[PDB]
Swiss-Prot record, chain A:
GO terms for biological process: translation. Induction: Strongly expressed during exponential growth, decreases 2-4-fold in stationary phase, part of the rpsF-ssbA-rpsR operon. The operon is induced by DNA damage by mitomycin C. The chain holds residues 14 to 77 of 79 of the full protein. This is Small ribosomal subunit protein bS18. The keyword Repressor does not apply. The keyword Ribosomal protein applies. Coiled coil: none annotated. Belongs to the bacterial ribosomal protein bS18 family. The lineage of its organism: Bacteria, Bacillati, Bacillota, Bacilli, Bacillales. Binds as a heterodimer with protein bS6 to the central domain of the 16S rRNA, where it helps stabilize the platform of the 30S subunit. It comes from the Bacteria. One of its GO terms (molecular function) is small ribosomal subunit rRNA binding. Part of the 30S ribosomal subunit. Forms a tight heterodimer with protein bS6. One of its GO terms (cellular component) is cytosolic small ribosomal subunit. Keywords: Ribonucleoprotein, Ribosomal protein, RNA-binding, rRNA-binding.
From Swiss-Prot, chain B:
Binds together with bS18 to 16S ribosomal RNA. GO terms for cellular component: cytoplasm; ribonucleoprotein complex; ribosome. Induction: Strongly expressed during exponential growth, decreases 2-4-fold in stationary phase, part of the rpsF-ssbA-rpsR operon. The operon is induced by DNA damage by mitomycin C. The gene is rpsF. Belongs to the bacterial ribosomal protein bS6 family. It comes from Bacillus subtilis (strain 168). GO terms for molecular function: small ribosomal subunit rRNA binding; structural constituent of ribosome. This is Small ribosomal subunit protein bS6. HAMAP family: Ribosomal_bS6 (MF_00360).
From Swiss-Prot, chain D:
It comes from Bacillus subtilis (strain 168). It comes from the Bacteria. GO terms for biological process: translation. This is Small ribosomal subunit protein uS15. The gene is rpsO. Belongs to the universal ribosomal protein uS15 family. One of the primary rRNA binding proteins, it binds directly to 16S rRNA where it helps nucleate assembly of the platform of the 30S subunit by binding and bridging several RNA helices of the 16S rRNA. Forms an intersubunit bridge (bridge B4) with the 23S rRNA of the 50S subunit in the ribosome.
UniProtKB/Swiss-Prot annotation, chain E:
It comes from Bacillus subtilis (strain 168). Keywords: Ribonucleoprotein, Ribosomal protein, RNA-binding, rRNA-binding. One of its GO terms (molecular function) is structural constituent of ribosome. This is Small ribosomal subunit protein uS11. Belongs to the universal ribosomal protein uS11 family. Part of the 30S ribosomal subunit. Interacts with proteins S7 and S18. Binds to IF-3. Interacts with VmlR. Interacts with BrxC. One of its GO terms (cellular component) is cytosolic small ribosomal subunit.
Length: 64, 95, 264, 85, 101
RNA sequence: GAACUUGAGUGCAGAAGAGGAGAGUGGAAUUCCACGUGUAGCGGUGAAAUGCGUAGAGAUGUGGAGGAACACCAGUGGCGAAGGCGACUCUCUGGUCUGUAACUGACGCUGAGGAGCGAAAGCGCGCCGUAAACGAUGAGUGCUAAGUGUUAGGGGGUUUCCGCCCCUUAGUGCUGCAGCUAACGCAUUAAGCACUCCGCCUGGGGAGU
RNA sequence: AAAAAAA
């Protein structure tokens, strides 16, 4: 029950780092909730954006 | 002028002569409109997460720049027009 | 580490005696029940986990892929648990029918003859066949007659042991929780039923939330999703949701623990 | 921009370390107002923005008037230098 | 002679229809609960969906399919059973996709 | 007249926003219509009609209606004066909070009228503009027990940091003293104790005539 | 409830 990004000290989430984001989507592709991941609020935001950028650029899917 | 990150995907059905021409074209666009290319990755042909314009793969180019809007804006304009670039995004580099 | 060293030895012995083609005792694990595994495959598709394979022809790896996917998720414990409830139990047998769980063709128990009788037999057959060199037809026919009765019996005595062991654990878990009546715990919904839902605590103590104690709404069980759904409130308690419970009643004799929902 | 603002400060400032004088602040606001007004010529419907304007404009007025009552001299000077009617 | 395809499963409360197409959405084959002569409640049930998937699938295997993408529409109970019936008919499922409007 | 920095603001450093206005762009579905697949369904529902059709349709693409919205994330989270604001990117722009204390030196508060923003409707996109536009609770400032949660910050302690611990700021929550209250309740997010200014009321009906 | 395995 700890934040990835507060643990590992990661200030900047990147949309391009597909692997990293892939942790935080469901198998279907849906964004995983904060309560499941344990993410910090702040980052949950950052993370959401990135995935949203990602998905736009076809890096990630909207519906796997 | 302020830092942006352009990414874009080139259609997968081109040879490396054509591809280079694309890159040089669009690199020429930016620097023509007062941009300076600080970085230029090439992620190479990836599988797309879904099928864009009937292609399941594409060549990603990631240009860092520093420029005025005008530059980026011109790029975006042309990027849209072009059939070689299938999708793109410009993004500001958050401070 | 030791486990692995006991496994490879066990696998080594079994393979040796398979190729020797003499009467021998194996430790088999047959392919799971196709009906039970089918339902399990349905169950995991509700959480989003899609499996490559049909229930009649599933390779162990395909099951392993799931257990990898759910690792460090809330839904781990239960999908794990429901997978288990799709597996067959492992038994002793004279035939080498393989061991599904270990994904191997040859397996026996060799490495604990002090506490298991099939291991003590494996040793006697080793002594008989390898050490003494007694691979005669009469020696084989003697053992081929007796192993089926041994294998069936010992397999029964194992199951007996497990059932009793567990029955004492549940009793002493119930004895532990007598003084915890009124205390709140965080737990996870391990199983959902038409009458209520089971919640496992962090120390693997399991207790029931009876639908009577769910006073906030009329809850209807959904069997397909594994969930109790409130009609009015629209509260949904599913398998693998974490909830906070309070200890209401514990019966030591019956080995019952009863919980009420404090919060989700 | 911050360079533009530093210009402004250097232009109006009453002494070396001064950024708090009406002068300064009026200077700044004034530009902001100006820049913003231009924004609203194009973005006529951007009401919200319009609101901040008013508050800007107001701030000014108070500062001018503060000044005009403190030291009319400085106030005359200023309004000429900024071109404020 | 096409190998890859989509299996469009429209599982309603009343019925299950199963169309199989090529990648360009041209119709190879189909079945439905009511095409197999189920009537009323029975068309709704997952057993009819299962059997509808098989019959759609067996028709596709004649046309020489191997791999499927699957799409699911509608709230019905058939999708789970129907999908398994596409795996059980032989055709490997690449990815299942809920495309409920 | 003169002096000051505590209020007010500007600097400088830092923080988070579905704040607003443009311009694209990503996916969705929608059914507008035609056409390529399609081959007998389909369609209610206790089950039969109700209907629906082989004139190849339910169904599946392809041209699209071309109009509305953007799931998961999403939280009595955040932002906004209110109405309100949730796809993504860029363009322009408003505000807020924290910290510093460098600067200005009371520059403040409220505010009738006025001006602007501002649902259904009303309807003729424009006027309209009235809104449980009533968390049933003007604004500002100071003072007056505690307990616990969350949002964005600041400092110190260990702690390598992560983590914990503590203190502080701003906001949002629950719980509860003093007091207040007709009771209900409120209780540092006051409906407590005060001062400033504004709005408003003085039986019901008639009559919002 | 319900699997190996270990013990």
């Amino acid at each position: 029950k700890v934040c990835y990004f507060t643990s590992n000290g990661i200030t900047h989430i990147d949309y391009k780092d597909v692997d990293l984001l892939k942790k935080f989507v469901s198998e279907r592709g849906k964004i995983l909730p904060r309560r499941v991941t344990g993410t910090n609020a702040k980052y949950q935001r950052k993370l959401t954006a990135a995935i949203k950028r990602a998905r736009q650029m076809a890096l990630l899917p909207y519906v796997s | 002028m302020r830092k942006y990150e352009v990414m874009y995907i080139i259609r997968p059905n081109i040879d490396e002569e054509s591809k280079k021409a694309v890159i040089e074209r669009f690199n020429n666009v930016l620097t023509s409109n007062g941009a300076e290319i600080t970085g230029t990755k090439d992620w190479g042909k990836r599988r797309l997460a879904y099928e864009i314009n009937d292609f399941r793969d594409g060549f990603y180019q990631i240009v860092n720049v520093q420029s005025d809007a005008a530059a980026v804006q011109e790029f975006d304009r042309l990027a849209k027009i072009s059939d070689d670039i299938i999708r793109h995004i410009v993004v500001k580099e958050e401070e | 580490l030791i486990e692995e060293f006991m496994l490879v030895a066990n696998e080594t012995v079994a393979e040796h005696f398979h190729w020797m083609n003499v009467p021998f005792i194996y430790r088999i694990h047959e392919e799971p029940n196709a009906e039970k595994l089918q339902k399990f495959l349905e169950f995991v598709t509700t959480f989003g986990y899609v499996v490559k394979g049909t229930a009649g022809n599933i390779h162990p790896r395909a099951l392993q892929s799931i257990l990898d996917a759910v690792r460090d998720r809330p839904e781990e414990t239960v999908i794990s648990t429901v997978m288990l409830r799709s597996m067959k139990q492992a038994k002793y047998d004279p035939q080498s029918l393989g061991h599904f769980g270990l994904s191997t063709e040859f397996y026996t128990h060799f490495t604990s003859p002090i506490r298991r009788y099939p291991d003590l037999i494996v040793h006697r057959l080793i002594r008989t066949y390898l050490i003494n060199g007694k691979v005669d037809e009469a020696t084989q026919e003697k053992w081929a007659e007796r192993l089926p009765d041994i294998a069936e019996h010992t397999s029964s005595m194992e199951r007996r042991a497990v059932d009793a062991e567990r029955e004492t654990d549940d009793l002493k878990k119930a004895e532990y929780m007598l003084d915890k009546i009124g205390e709140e715990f965080d737990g996870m919904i391990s199983s959902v039923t038409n009458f209520g839902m089971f919640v496992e605590l962090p120390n693997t103590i399991e207790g029931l939330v009876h639908v009577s104690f769910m006073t906030d709404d009329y809850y209807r069980f959904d069997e397909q999703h594994f969930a109790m759904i409130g009609e009015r409130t629209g509260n949904v308690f599913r398998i693998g949701d974490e909830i906070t419970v309070k200890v209401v009643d514990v019966n030591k004799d019956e080995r019952n623990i009863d919980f009420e929902i404090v919060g989700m | 921009t911050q360079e533009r603002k530093n210009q402004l400060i250097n232009e109006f400032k009453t002494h070396e370390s001064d950024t708090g004088s009406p002068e300064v602040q009026i200077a700044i606001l004034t530009d902001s107002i100006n820049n913003l007004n231009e924004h609203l010529r194009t973005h006529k419907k951007d009401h919200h923005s319009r609101r901040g304007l008013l508050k800007m404009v107001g701030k000014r007025r108070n500062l001018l008037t503060y000044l005009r009552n403190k030291d009319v001299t400085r106030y005359r000077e200023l309004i000429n230098k900024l071109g404020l009617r | 002679n096409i190998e890859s395809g989509i299996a469009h499963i429209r599982s309603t409360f009343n019925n299950t229809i199963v169309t199989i197409t090529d990648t360009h959405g041209n119709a190879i084959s189909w079945s439905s609960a009511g095409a197999l002569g189920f009537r009323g409640s029975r068309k709704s049930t997952p057993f009819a969906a299962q059997m509808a998937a098989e019959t759609a699938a067996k028709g596709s295997i004649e046309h020489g399919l191997k791999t499927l993408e699957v799409t699911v529409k509608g709230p019905g109970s058939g999708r789970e059973a129907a999908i398994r019936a596409l795996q059980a008919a032989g055709l490997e499922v690449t990815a299942i996709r809920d495309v409920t409007p």
